[PDB]
Amino acid sequence: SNTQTVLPFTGLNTPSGVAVDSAGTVYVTDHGNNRVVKLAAGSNTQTVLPFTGLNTPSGVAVDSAGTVYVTDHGNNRVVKLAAGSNTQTVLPFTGLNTPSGVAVDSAGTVYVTDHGNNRVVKLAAGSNTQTVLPFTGLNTPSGVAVDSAGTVYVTDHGNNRVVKLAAGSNTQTVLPFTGLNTPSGVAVDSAGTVYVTDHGNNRVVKLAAGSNTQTVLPFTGLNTPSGVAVDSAGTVYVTDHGNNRVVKLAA
């Protein structure tokens, strides 16, 4: 499609992160309102999820079980809320500094960009012991995504680049995007195409697997886009942070 639609969220203030579940429900961190909202597919009415005590939530992820994970940026913690639950749980990460992005793989392992510590950490399901991933030279990493192969993609915000680390690899690779300015968010679809919010350039770019040539997606009127998500239909969802809105673009 060449034509975005603005999703019917209400009252957003600088939305940061977005995620979409297998049912097409869209989850958004309403950063400026210390809340997380969701919108079911076709619904005109959001619901505020029952998290407690959030401070400028940044990133959001949702797993196949419908559990919602949120980086509670201002409180240096990551919280999760099981589907239908009333009570969040704080995940046992240690030593976070302004965590910024979160992703969850098919095994339930949780990956977090520890923005203030220039590192990415992961926590296996049920584990009490995080592991720091062997990225090199990160500067304020913002967003993270993980594909079905376990490859981890990170927007290295301060270095104007996107890096990836294959499962079990010691050595990251810098993806061949061009001309990025403070990239914030990243998503990867089932075909391995990587989508990045090029925050400082008011645009969203994608790079197909093995391609050397990005394409700029035909969104219009973006202002400092933060987060991006892609569903199984290839629809791309973007938090248009500066315009207090969320937009989507069908394939």
Side-chain angles (χ1 to χ4, degrees), residues 187-202:
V188 56
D189 70 15
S190 61
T193 295
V194 181
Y195 304 78
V196 172
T197 49
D198 190 11
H199 175 271
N201 291 324
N202 293 332

Side-chain angles (χ1 to χ4, degrees), residues 7-15 30-35 37 46 48 244-245:
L7 284 180
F9 287 103
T10 61
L12 302 182
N13 184 3
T14 60
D30 190 13
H31 172 274
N33 294 321
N34 294 334
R35 70 182 183 166
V37 299
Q46 64 188 26
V48 179
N244 296 330
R245 70 185 183 164

Side-chain angles (χ1 to χ4, degrees), residues 63-146:
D63 68 15
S64 58
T67 298
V68 179
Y69 305 77
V70 173
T71 51
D72 190 11
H73 172 101
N75 293 321
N76 293 333
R77 71 184 182 165
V78 183
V79 298
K80 73 174 171 170
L81 188 59
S85 173
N86 330 92
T87 71
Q88 63 190 25
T89 297
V90 177
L91 286 177
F93 286 103
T94 63
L96 301 182
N97 184 0
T98 60
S100 60
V102 57
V104 185
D105 69 17
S106 59
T109 295
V110 181
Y111 303 78
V112 172
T113 51
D114 191 13
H115 170 275
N117 291 323
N118 294 332
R119 71 183 183 165
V120 183
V121 300
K122 72 177 177 167
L123 188 59
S127 173
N128 35 67
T129 295
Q130 65 186 28
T131 288
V132 179
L133 283 66
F135 288 104
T136 297
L138 301 182
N139 185 5
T140 63
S142 294
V144 55
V146 56

